[PDB]
Amino acid sequence: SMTEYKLVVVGAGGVGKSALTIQLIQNHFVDEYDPTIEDSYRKQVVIDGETCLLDILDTAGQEEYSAMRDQYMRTGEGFLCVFAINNTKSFEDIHHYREQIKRVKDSEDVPMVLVGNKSDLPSRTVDTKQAQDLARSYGIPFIETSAKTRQRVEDAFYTLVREIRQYRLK
Ligand SMILES: O=C1c2cc(cnc2NCc2ccc(O)cc2)S(=O)(=O)NC2=[SH]c3c(Cl)ccc(O)c3N2CCCCCN1[C@H]1CC[C@]2(CCCN2)CC1
Ligand SMILES: Nc1nc2c(ncn2[C@@H]2O[C@H](COP(=O)(O)OP(=O)(O)O)[C@@H](O)[C@H]2O)c(=O)[nH]1
Ligand SMILES: [Mg+2]
C-alpha cells in the first residue's frame, strides 16, 4: 500500500536546491556542494495516512537548451521552485522556470510550490509580501525554508505531494 510521487527541485544556481534535498533525505546541511551534481533520491514517508515513495531529482540546470531537462520536466509530477530570500535575481528567475515547465507540460495547471530558501539569513532582499503575491498570481503555495536549520524542509516537500495528490482528482 504505497503511492509514488516524482518531484523535481528547480531554481537558480546557489539558492539551496541540493542543501534542501540533502537535508530532507540525509538530515545534514551541506556547506559547499558541487553545483553541477544532479542526482535522484528515493525515500518512503507517511503523509496524511498514505505511505508515499518520494523520487526527488535535484537539478543543477543552467543550460538554455537541454533534451534531458525537457525529459525530466515531462517525467516530473511536481516542481519545487526555489529562490533565495537574499537574492532578488533568483526570485525574478522563478517566472522563467515556471514558463519552461508549462511549455513542456502543455498545461497552465502544474503542481508547484514556491520556496523562499535561506530564511535564517537576516539581510532579506525579497519581501515575504511580494513572494506571497507571486504565489497567489500562480495559484500555488508559498513556503519559506532554511536548509541550514531544517525550518519547513519537510513541509515544502510534503506540501508539493499534497498538490500532486489533489491535481490527480481534477
Ligand atoms: O542521468 C540522469 C538523468 C536522468 C534523466 C534526466 N536527467 C538526468 N540528469 C540531469 C541532466 C543530465 C544531462 C543533461 O545534459 C542535463 C540534465 S531521466 O528523465 O531519464 N530520469 C529521470 S527523470 C526523474 C524525475 Cl523527473 C524525478 C525523479 C527521478 O528519479 C527521475 N529520473 C531518474 C533518475 C535521474 C537521475 C539523474 N541522472 C543520473 C543517473 C545515474 C546516476 C549515477 C548513478 C546513479 N545516479 C547519476 C545521475
Ligand atoms: N544560510 C543558508 N545557506 C544556505 C541554505 N541553503 C543553502 N545554503 C548555502 O548556499 C550555497 C548553495 O547551496 P546549494 O544547495 O549548493 O545550491 P544549489 O546550487 O541550488 O544546489 C551553499 O553554500 C549552501 O551551504 C540556507 O537555508 N541557509
Ligand atoms: Mg545543487
Proportion of the chain in helix, strand, coil states, percent, rounded to 5: 35, 25, 35
Going from the C-alpha of 82 to that of each of 18, 89, 168, the distances in angstroms are 11, 12, 23
Map grid coordinates 515547465 to a residue. 101
User: Which atom of ligand 1 is nearest the CA belonging to 75?
Assistant: 26
Does 17 contact ligand 1 (Cβ within 6 A)? no
Does 120 contact ligand 2 (Cβ within 6 A)? yes
Going from the C-alpha of 80 to that of each of 1, 15, 114, 133, 160, the distances in angstroms are 25, 12, 6, 17, 7
Does 62 contact ligand 1 (Cβ within 6 A)? no
CA–CA gap between residue 79 and residue 141 (Å, rounded): 12
Does 106 contact ligand 2 (Cβ within 6 A)? no
- Asked: is 3-167 a CATH 3.40.50.300 domain? The reply is yes
User: Which atom of ligand 1 is nearest the CA belonging to 77?
Assistant: 26
Specify whether the CB–CB gap between 74 and 123 falls below 8 A: no
Map grid coordinates 545534514 to a residue. 28
In degrees, to the nearest 5, what angle opens at C-alpha 81 toward C-alphas 76 and 87?
A: 155
PDB experimental method: X-ray
Specify whether the CB–CB gap between 20 and 82 falls below 8 A: yes
* Cα 69 to middle of ligand 3, angstroms: 15
DSSP 146: B
Going from the C-alpha of 143 to that of each of 38, 47, 78, 94, 118, the distances in angstroms are 23, 17, 15, 14, 11
Does 41 contact ligand 1 (Cβ within 6 A)? no
In degrees, to the nearest 5, what angle opens at C-alpha 30 toward C-alphas 28 and 36?
A: 135
Rg (CA), the chain: 15
Query: Which ligand minimizes its atom distance to the CA of 15?
Result: 2
CA–CA gap between residue 160 and residue 150 (Å, rounded): 17
CA–CA gap between residue 167 and residue 155 (Å, rounded): 18
Estimate to the nearest angstrom the gap between the alpha carbon of 127 and the chain centroid: 19
CA–CA gap between residue 54 and residue 156 (Å, rounded): 13
Which residues are placed with Cβ below 5 angstroms of ligand 3, an ion?
17-18, 60
Estimate to the nearest angstrom the gap between the alpha carbon of 76 and the chain centroid: 11
Estimate to the nearest angstrom the gap between the alpha carbon of 33 and the chain centroid: 17
